[PDB]
Amino acid sequence: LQNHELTLWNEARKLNPNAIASATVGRRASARMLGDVMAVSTCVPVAPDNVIVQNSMRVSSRPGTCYSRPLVSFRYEDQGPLIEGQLGENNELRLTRDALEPCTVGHRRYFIFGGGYVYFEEYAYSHQLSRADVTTVSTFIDLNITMLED
Amino acid sequence: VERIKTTSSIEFARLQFTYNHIQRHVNDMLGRIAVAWCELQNHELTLWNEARKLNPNAIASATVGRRASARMLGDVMAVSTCVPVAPDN
């Protein structure tokens, strides 16, 4: 099974190296492909109290094109300077706010934030919500094991 | 001051050991399988988070249990049930 499963993984690392490497190595790391292998680097932990979310995903300087992912301000330490950035995939912080797409009518988006989600409507913040608020379908195949009674 | 009476058949004890031995082993092995199963899914999920980005339709249809349309809406996808159509139409 594993020998078979690997064939998917060699593809998955192409699709999203960060998640694949993070799951495979055992630590939250950032990776990038360098041909037939990925380079990794440990990511710095950040407390959730030191991160604030900027409101509007619009861009005042370039109309029609606007951010695809929420913008945040984070500080490494409680007394550290406030540094701009944008939220990423599975709670990762991007220094460059380069996630720009043409603005679309009917913009309703959910983003992973902390232990829950943040919901935006028309490139504007709408509200936060907890994980339990969204129904869950299981990707796991259940297997119930009971031991022999002594 | 009493005299101890001894049963004439040790077999029960042997049975116990036998029933212990087998049991212990399986209660080990199956348990390992359980863990081995668990991590698998926990590991497998990392593939799925990519697959849903490729075509949310098939992924949602397989995971939910009904043929549904899906569209990726940020970090989560929205689904909608799909109506049947006869093959002659």
Binding site: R131, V137, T139 | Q41, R52, T63, A68, A78, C82, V85
Partner: peptide, 20 residues
């Protein structure tokens, strides 16, 4: 041997995968 047809989904119905 039967077909399925359906429009794009709406934001009303949202579903997430289970965490480990």
């Amino acid at each position: 041997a039967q077909f399925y047809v359906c429009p794009p989904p709406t934001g009303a119905t949202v579903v997430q995968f289970e965490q480990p």
